[PDB]
Amino acid sequence: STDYDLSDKSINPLGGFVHYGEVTNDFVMLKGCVVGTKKRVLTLRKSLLVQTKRRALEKIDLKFIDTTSKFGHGRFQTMEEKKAFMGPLKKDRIAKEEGA
Amino acid sequence: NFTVDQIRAIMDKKANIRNMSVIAHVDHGKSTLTDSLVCKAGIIASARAGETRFTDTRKDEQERCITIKSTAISLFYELSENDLNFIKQSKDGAGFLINLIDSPGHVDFSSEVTAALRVTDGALVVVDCVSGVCVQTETVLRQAIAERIKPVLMMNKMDRALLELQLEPEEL
Amino acid sequence: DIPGLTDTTVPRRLGPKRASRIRKLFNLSKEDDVRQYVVRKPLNKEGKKPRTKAPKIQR
Amino acid sequence: MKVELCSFSGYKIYPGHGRRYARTDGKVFQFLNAKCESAFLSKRNPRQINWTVLYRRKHKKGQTRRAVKFQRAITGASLADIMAKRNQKPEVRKAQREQAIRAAKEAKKAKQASKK
Amino acid sequence: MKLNISFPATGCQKLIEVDDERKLRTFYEKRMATEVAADALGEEWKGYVVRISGGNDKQG
Amino acid sequence: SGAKFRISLGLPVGAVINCADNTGAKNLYIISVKGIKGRLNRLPAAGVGDMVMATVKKGKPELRKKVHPAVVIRQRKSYRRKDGVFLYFEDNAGVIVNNKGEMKGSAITGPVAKECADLWPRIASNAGSIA
RNA sequence: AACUGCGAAUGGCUCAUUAAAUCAGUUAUGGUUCCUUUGGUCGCUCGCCACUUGGAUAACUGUGGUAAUUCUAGA
RNA sequence: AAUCCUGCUCAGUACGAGAGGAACCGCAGGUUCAGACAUUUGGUGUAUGUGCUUGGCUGAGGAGCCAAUGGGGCGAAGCU
Ligand SMILES: [Mg+2]
Ligand SMILES: [Mg+2]
Ligand SMILES: [Mg+2]
Ligand SMILES: [Mg+2]
Ligand SMILES: [Mg+2]
Ligand SMILES: [Mg+2]
Ligand SMILES: [Mg+2]
Ligand SMILES: [Mg+2]
Ligand SMILES: [Mg+2]
């Protein structure tokens, strides 16, 4: 949830991280791509340089974080968004019919 | 900013016209000074801040920022009575008409300097206080005094002396 | 009630001009002083004499 | 959180998703994915494609005026006076028409007298 | 955003300028000739139901 | 000021792109790209907003057997617009300009990519629309 | 000022097109239409307002949008 | 194992009669190269995943199959 999204969602995509699982504990977001496959252990280290350029000293304020399904070309951020868009389905209808 | 009627009304006067031209060395502020005067005085001239005014009437003049062809402008303005008291010449009313002819300051356009000088009867010499008396200001002065013109001086770019040069008041 | 809007009702610009229109607007039954019952508009201006005139009833 | 686009197929397009195609005639379209884009380039109408927003709406899938009798004033009149006049007593009303009847009678008397 | 408001029974229709899209979402994504309540325009506007009659573009 | 960011190139040497001006040229045969320092065997390529050297193959005979500077205004290869928008056009297009950058024609048919328009203000002014 | 009725399909300009096409004479429309003008015809048909019906709509009062048009919206 | 260039500012400034016309700090980016990565865009695609479809074959339907991957559309993961 960013300071502008205000949406109840976790960092996990719709359908769980592919080949990893559900991310529950703390996490660190990093710009760009890092080495290794999924669920590969990485050693984060404090930098040995003195960071003085503008890119290093720049603040980062997110406005939106994408959480569509990475298991294909997902097009819905949250379950609630997807259920609101499609509406009632066949599986939902028969399950409601039986359960009453 | 008045109509052509009062233009003729003060044009018939001969004791308050002042034919003059501005003469200086290349890049001494002649265009800048004329533009500010067109802003302040002017028979119909307003105070537009769009860089160079009608004194550069060419597309290449505005592209290169070199004044090439001389342009004539006319200024109308009034002065208070206590201001008129200093004018010991033939004085007729508070209105005054100036026929300014902006002369290009390059050595090759010295002929255009002559054409302006024949028409005018006075000269406003513009001297950069940073660069002192230059070669072209020396030549155009020689030209005007040979043609019997009254020159009156104005040192320009005094801000340059006080900021870029950081001169103290004594040496200034 | 908002000020200026839900208050100081402006009267309708003109009164009815058709005979049945004034008859229904006043619930007249059958020829009840219909000639004088039209509204007589007074116009008033300062540099003249204020006067009043009634419209041309039709139908 | 840029502007939320929509594809031709009606779906929302979030930033960083899909592709946008600009035509020579100055028209710009957005496509959610290559399935939508190829369908557009092959010029298939979205109203014959089941899973599209336009088709659902067209096939109805997933699916009073006001009369007022305001009574106001009339300029040059009085608000209370007009309601009182339009609600006048029937005895006053019949008295008004009978005195109009005799008024026409005496005008007939004046008309005969003037004709004489 | 300017918003002309007109009362048929009283007239003297006025212009209300508003600078809050959050309170303007009551009319956003609606259609004209539909009746919606302007109670989100302040509690002074509570109990007030209006209908969209017209409107002008940014270009007029 | 702010320099233009990289875009996918798509138009190497030998690309024949439409000529969207009104100079009478029908197409531009790209022969080189300005500012390309190159590499062994690598074709110099150009995206939108790039100044190229081109010869018109179809068009008025007074322009045909000559080399002109040109600017690519539309490209068909899709490129990222630094905020995730992958834009591409229906066709490759370019106009004929001079070294200064003034456009030799007087009108442009079709849109102009925002990257080309912002680099070349005179091309932007003659552009009918910006995509 | 505005609705309504009529005019704006006349006149003026020019000769680009066009070679049985235009056009000139002749002739038919018993193979057609026709505001306007005139003359016929306008109680010829048996059928709870007629002492005369309804909703409006202008111009108009007021709120404006637009940089702009002989643009119009809202009540 | 990094490399080079361009744009802006300095600045139409210093210098120069003029024409012309820089530099250091700073900012924004690109070229060539290196090391990675697949969120996004593209490519592949025998998941022989799901439709479409030719010829034939299972009496017909349904469901399928064979034609050295029948052809073609869209395509998850993965690789790129
Ligand atoms: Mg994926
Ligand atoms: Mg009448
Ligand atoms: Mg080779
Ligand atoms: Mg007619
Ligand atoms: Mg078959
Ligand atoms: Mg079958
Ligand atoms: Mg077999
Ligand atoms: Mg075989
Ligand atoms: Mg494919």
Structure tokens at D65: 């005026």
Q: CB contacts < 8 Å between D and E, how many?
A: 7
- Asked whether the beta carbons of F23 and F68 are under 8 A apart, the reply is no
Cβ of B65 < 7 Å from strand H?
A: yes
CA D56 vs CA A75, D46, D48: distances in Å: 18, 10, 10
Q: Of F1, F3, F2, F6, which is closest to residue F80 (Cα–Cα)?
A: F6
- Interchain contact F83–D (C-beta under 8 A): yes
In units of Å, what resolution does this entry have?
A: 2.9
CA C19 vs CA A51, A69, D86: distances in Å: 92, 74, 15
Give chain F residues 73-102 with Cβ within 7 A of strand H. 78, 80, 84, 86
Helix (H) / strand (E) containing D68? none
Structure tokens at E51: 């209908």
- Asked whether the beta carbons of C21 and C38 are under 8 A apart, the reply is no
**Experimental method used, please?**
cryo-EM
The full 3-state SS of chain C, as one line of letters, equals CCCCCCCCCCCECCCCCEHHHHHHHHCCCCCCCCCCCCCCEEECCCCCCCEEECCCCEC
Cβ of E22 < 7 Å from strand G?
A: no
Structure tokens at A23: 């991310």
Q: Tell me D74's DSSP state.
A: B
Residue F39 has phi, psi (to 5 degrees) of: -160, 160
Sorted by sequence, the CB contacts under 8 Å of residue B84 that are 6+ apart come out as: B91, B94
Q: Of B24, B7, B8, which is closest to residue B153 (Cα–Cα)?
A: B24
Q: Do chains D and E touch (3 or more CB pairs under 8 A)?
A: yes
CA B152 vs CA B85, B121, B144, F46: distances in Å: 20, 12, 11, 60
Chain D residues inside the 8 Å CB shell of C39: 74, 76-77, 82
B102 by DSSP, 3-state: which?
strand
Sorted by sequence, the CB contacts under 8 Å of residue D62 that are 6+ apart come out as: A87, D56
Structure tokens at A88: 């009632």
* Residues composing chain F: 131
B11 by DSSP, 3-state: which?
helix
CA of residue B139 relative to chain centroid, distance: 17
Residue D30 has phi, psi (to 5 degrees) of: -125, 145
How many Cβ atoms sit within 10 Å of the Cβ of residue B167?
A: 15
Residue of chain D whose Cα is closest to the Cα of A70: D17
- Interchain contact F87–D (C-beta under 8 A): yes
